[PDB]
Design a binder for these strands. Structure first.
Ligand SMILES: [Zn+2]
Lengths: 1028, 94, 98, 36, 35
DNA sequence: AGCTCGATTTTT
DNA sequence: GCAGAATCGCCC
């Protein structure tokens, strides 16, 4: 059975009405796409703020009545975004800068893109779609829509039925909803003005939804793309070719020696993405716990509305590095330029990037001239990235562009220039600005652009095979410890790591490396480490014994291990931001094109173009090519998806009489029903892989991986102890003037150590020899290029260096993945001019005065030494990928794929990337403790006693049991009964009489009840024949 | 290059050469020369990036910059030395 | 099962579907545990070859010509073997057989 | 392609009566039409 | 019809046909029996 | 009446 | 500039 079969009958969508007197307008604005002067905006679908608790995201939509006595059902999930269209001026903007709507309109025309064309009717008047008696001036109005019928919403083909109203609680607010049905549920017809239409809603969808999907296919005719997606949903056209006539090609493709085959492969890849991406998006999805806004942990310490709004702004700053990476990276998914041809045979066709290519003129599928190109334009100068390229990245949408500018306001400036206040009072205030007229100089988009200028990418016209950058939610099962997926199943490497954390818990160390007791001095600092080393070395033995007795070939299984990350294919798993809708949809469309390239090439090699145009060639071949794609794209190493049949159990269902409801009368009927579609394609994950071990086989590469063995002078300060020797410096050397770095570098060259005024000399001579000894042992043995920050990472490094040595892996460093994690900080506002608002600024002295008392929130990324603990917190991720394709082994002739982790392009992305083969990076933000929520003492006494008695050998245990009881219970031991003693001793309950006789001697000898006094009394107060 | 790459290179060039003396005052003077009054709010995440390979030094740099900030001298390399330079047992090991 | 007959006769149903079904068969019948076959491209090296003048030979006169030549078909499907298997060991698992 | 059983009592007297024995007819070609 | 060149019809069939191989083990035994 | 089996090459 | 890989599931 499946989630589709289990979903209930219902409408095609809803109109929600929220009361303006009580609804939390400033909270929704922080999650919205509002610009100054808007008439519509987008917000996320969330239980407890935009829909009621218990909203069903999966439904069977009643969409057609073939006659008045039969219904047809379509299984579909909801669309991720909600569109706010009535009284939308009541929701605050996310960004204060003026003039965005005209800037978007001008820039859409120079790139040759299609603007929204309105229907010849007026928009529906409030009295047509409002419930009876509600005042239109008192409410905010918004649409929630199913993924299969959203083009029908755009085209004005839905009907609202106000008599079928339902009253619903949305957080605190008493709200109302009205259902939407497709006009095909009325076979006798309804009048054309009785259908629901809003021109501001349709224009918002054109810009914020469909234009970015057109950019992902390299199509300019957005309105024709919407028409062909509607007919594909309503008339089952998935196996019919449809996008090829809308395609356009650059001069590098038209001048190519293989141009005829390239035009067919580029066209067929786009056709397949349009066939399969909508089907996977419409499928039934799991409901994440992050969809419930009132259980979000981030609000837990908040009191009142101001604290809740300030908590949402901190939440948004933690997501900003994902959004700014997709703007600053030269190889961003937003800058994909098309397909080109060389690489090995299956890699020979590949995806290209470049904004210079995107400016050029084009030719149609019949080699005739099409778009004529744009020559380019500001403060970044000639041939460089300009504000128009940011408008192109935002799909010419003022709603998307406003939310991009809001995320860019968290970014630091990096000068490669006028002072900020002399720019804001100077050139930003000029009447020549086409955005603010100089009347809003501190928040203007041109001021933000001037500040971030040296971080934007270069403008490229080349055709090289590079990785592209993707963003989204991670899946459930990531393998990102030092040896990745090594022994993941059959003890398992997962179980080995759980055993080590249990040993570290007995030493007083938690899963994040925090101590229950900090080291007191030199002896305690040495003792702390020697116990961890002994605990790791004990677990290596028990593991190597398991591999030996089972004859497992672990020595060859190390050679083939990979790091693995899962990219989720659920649209509801993404973070609650409308920009992540576009980043997810464009990542999916790009991955489906890149997977399809060799499938199209092999079919065309067998069925050549012979001078046909792609629309002519596809007319015969496309139905067969769909079936090859379904067989060869899925379960072949990147994409996983499950096919299923959807069934409805009852022959009829309880539904309102829609003919009576159109006339205002409400009552039920048991309408006969059947499914209009049976097959569903449920998407699961996209899988990303990185190879762990370099084997020395590729002789060109060795110099990047090779392990040196000679005795360096940096061996202590670049060794395993330096971070701890710094963290504990004030406890090791009380009141010393020396830096920790100089103290240990002086020791590393002069062999001497300072002894505090009352402390003992030989205690410090031992500390020095511990540091020296372990640092030289690490210099010899280590193949993991990390300086560990905490005892858990120190322990895990020691463990994995032992396994690699047993495998004979000693000549090379292993590959590393490092996580870049956002840290949010408050700074003085002097260089962050947007805190001043739409305020007029008259002089640099007034700018300096007004900023002198103010602070700005900013974000930077910090490198973690331990990606696997971040992956346990279910992170939002951003990473580079190339999809490589290769033949099977053992004489097989099929094609298999891997999505391999690559590199970021462009020097503005992050300062930690500024200069490798052997280190790669991922950006990660955790969701546990932000949007998703994370014994009796007599059981613990009992466990600790069974742990003593099961280990004590060659001595009688009663004194060590009595000391543990006197420690845990003190004076309460004086009356310990036999029934209590027998329970606490557990398996060893036979010992009870000897324990109670011993406790009576402590009670009667008049010493106090403490473990120190118990030993002092007991330790102050044989014949043995051998047997055959 | 970005200017933060040039500050970082100049600090790694000092720390890799300074011998027989503790380097924190010579690092603090190079920061006060390159950033002036902007040192008064230098965060640990910025300080760790600028120190590069030697990021362990960051706590001692920030404790030193707070003494310049609170003693009320102006942010220049000449005043920094004039304050800092106005304001042991050692056993040998086998 | 994915493309049902819906009361069509087989010649009507095959008119739409057969070109796709050929490609499924080539992908799913070969190297899957019974039949093995190798696909190959056939090429001729020379642009002309030594052949008799067939117009003269029809009239009884015999002499040679270097006629220009090209292949009318390029793909070839070379069959190899059909494989027959028989299990050696009964493992005791199917309790009806013991 | 799993090896099976012959049907019909006229095929060969050695087949006249199992799970655990199967038969094939074989005639050699080395020393008849091909040289050793 | 005609049989192919590579048949595996000793008592354990295709057991250890490639990696010593079961074919090599049978060749060793025939050499001992020759002595 | 009459197992279960992810598959290809290798080729002695 | 920036390896190589037959693949699916399983989830302790
Ligand atoms: Zn302006």
């Amino acid at each position: 059975d499946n989630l589709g079969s289990q979903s209930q009958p219902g409408p095609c969508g809803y109109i929600y009405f929220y009361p303006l007197a009580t609804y939390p307008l400033r909270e929704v604005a922080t999650l919205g796409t509002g610009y100054a002067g808007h008439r519509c905006l987008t917000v996320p679908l969330l239980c407890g703020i935009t829909v009621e608790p218990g909203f069903s995201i999966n439904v069977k939509a009643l969409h057609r009545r073939p006659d008045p006595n039969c219904g047809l059902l379509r299984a579909t999930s909801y669309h991720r975004d909600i569109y706010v269209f009535h009284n939308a001026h009541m929701v605050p903007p996310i960004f204060e800068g003026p003039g965005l709507e005209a800037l978007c309109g001008e820039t859409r025309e120079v790139f040759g893109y299609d603007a929204y064309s309105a229907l010849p009717r007026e928009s529906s008047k409030p009295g047509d779609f409002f419930p009876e008696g509600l005042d239109p001036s008192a409410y905010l109005g918004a649409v929630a829509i199913t993924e299969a019928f959203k083009e029908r919403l755009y085209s004005g083909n839905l009907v609202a039925i106000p008599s079928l109203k339902q009253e619903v609680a949305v957080g605190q607010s008493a709200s109302v909803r009205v259902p939407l049905y497709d006009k095909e549920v009325f076979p006798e017809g309804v009048p054309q003005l009785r259908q629901f239409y809003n021109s501001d809603l349709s224009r918002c969808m054109h810009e914020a939804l469909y234009t970015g999907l057109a950019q992902a296919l390299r199509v300019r005719r957005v309105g024709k793309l919407v028409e062909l997606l509607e007919k594909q949903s309503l008339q089952d056209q998935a196996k019919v070719a449809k996008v090829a006539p809308l395609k356009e090609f650059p001069a590098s493709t038209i001048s190519h020696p293989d141009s005829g085959a390239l035009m067919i492969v580029d066209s067929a890849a786009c056709e397949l993405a349009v066939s399969y991406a909508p089907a996977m998006l419409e499928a039934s999805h799991e409901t994440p716990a992050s969809l419930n806004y009132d259980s979000w942990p981030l609000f837990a310490d908040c009191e009142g509305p101001e604290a809740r709004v300030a908590a949402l702004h901190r939440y948004n700053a933690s997501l900003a590095p994902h959004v700014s990476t997709q703007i600053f990276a030269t190889n961003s998914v937003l800058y994909v330029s098309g397909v080109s041809k060389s690489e090995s045979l299956f890699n020979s066709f590949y995806m290209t990037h470049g904004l210079g290519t995107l400016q050029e003129g084009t030719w149609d599928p019949c080699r005739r001239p099409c778009f004529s190109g744009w020559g380019g334009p500001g403060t970044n100068g000639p041939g460089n990235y300009a504000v128009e390229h940011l408008v192109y990245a935002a799909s010419f949408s003022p709603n998307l562009l406003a939310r991009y500018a809001y995320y860019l306001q968290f970014c630091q400036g990096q000068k490669s220039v006028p002072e900020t206040g002399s720019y804001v009072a100077g050139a930003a205030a000029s009447p020549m600005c086409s955005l603010c007229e100089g009347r809003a100089p501190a928040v203007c988009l041109n001021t933000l652009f001037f500040r971030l200028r040296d971080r934007f990418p270069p403008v490229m016209s080349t055709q090289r095979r590079d990785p592209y950058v993707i963003s989204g939610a991670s899946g459930s099962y990531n393998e990102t410890d030092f040896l990745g997926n090594f022994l993941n199943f059959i003890y398992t490497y997962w179980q080995l790591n759980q055993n080590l954390l249990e040993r570290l818990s007995r030493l007083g160390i938690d899963a994040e490396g925090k101590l229950e007791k900090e080291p007191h001095g030199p002896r305690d600092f040495v003792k702390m480490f020697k116990d961890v080393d002994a605990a790791v070395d004990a677990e290596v033995v028990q593991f190597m014994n398991s591999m030996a007795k089972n004859n497992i070939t672990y020595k060859d299984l190390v050679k083939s291990c990979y790091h693995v990350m899962q990219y989720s294919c659920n649209p509801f798993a993404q973070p609650a931001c409308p920009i992540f809708t576009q980043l997810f949809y464009r990542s999916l469309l790009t991955i489906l094109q890149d997977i399809s390239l060799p499938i199209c090439m092999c079919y065309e090699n067998d069925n050549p173009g012979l001078g046909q145009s792609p629309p002519e060639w596809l007319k015969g071949h496309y139905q067969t090519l769909c079936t090859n794609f379904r067989s060869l794209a899925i379960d072949k190493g990147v994409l996983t998806a499950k096919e299923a049949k959807v069934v409805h159990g009852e022959p009829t269902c309880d539904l309102p009489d829609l003919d009576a409801a159109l006339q205002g009368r409400v009552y039920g009927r048991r309408l006969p029903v059947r499914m209009s579609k049976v097959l569903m394609l449920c998407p699961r994950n996209i899988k990303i892989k990185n190879r762990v071990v370099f084997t020395g086989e590729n002789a060109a590469l060795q110099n990047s991986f090779i392990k040196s063995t000679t005795r360096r002078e940096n061996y202590i300060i670049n060794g395993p102890y330096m971070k701890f020797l710094n963290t504990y410096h004030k406890t090791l050397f009380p009141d010393t003037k020396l830096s920790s770095l100089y103290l240990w570098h002086n020791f590393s060259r002069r062999r001497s150590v300072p002894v505090p005024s009352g402390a003992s000399a030989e205690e410090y001579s031992d500390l020095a020899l511990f540091v020296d000894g372990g640092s030289r042992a690490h210099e010899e043995s280590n193949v993991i290029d990390v300086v560990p920050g905490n005892l858990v990472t120190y322990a895990k490094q020691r463990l994995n260096n032992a396994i690699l040595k047993a495998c004979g892996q000693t000549q090379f460093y292993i590959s590393l993945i490092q996580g870049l994690v956002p840290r949010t900080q408050s700074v003085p506002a002097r260089d962050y001019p947007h805190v001043l608002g739409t305020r007029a600024v008259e002089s640099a002295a007034a700018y300096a005065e007004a900023t002198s008392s103010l602070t700005a929130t900013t974000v930077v990324c910090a490198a973690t030494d331990c990606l696997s603990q971040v992956c346990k917190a279910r992170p939002v991720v951003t990473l580079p990928v190339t999809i490589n394709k290769y033949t099977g082994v053992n004489g097989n002739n099929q094609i298999f794929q891997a999505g391999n982790l690559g590199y970021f392009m462009g020097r503005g992305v992050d300062r930690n990337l500024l200069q490798s083969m052997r280190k790669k990076f991922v950006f990660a933000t955790p969701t546990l403790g932000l949007t998703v929520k994370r014994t009796y003492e007599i059981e613990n006494i009992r466990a600790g006693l069974e742990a003593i008695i099961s280990q004590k050998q060659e001595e009688d245990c009663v004194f060590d049991v009595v000391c543990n009881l006197v420690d845990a219970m003190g004076e309460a031991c004086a009356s310990l009964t036999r029934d209590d003693a027998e329970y606490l001793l557990g398996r060893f309950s036979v010992l009870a009489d000897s324990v109670l006789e011993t406790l009576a001697t402590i009670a009667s000898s008049g010493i106090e009840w403490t473990a120190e006094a118990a030993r002092d009394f007991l330790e102050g107060v044989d014949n043995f024949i051998s047997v055959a």
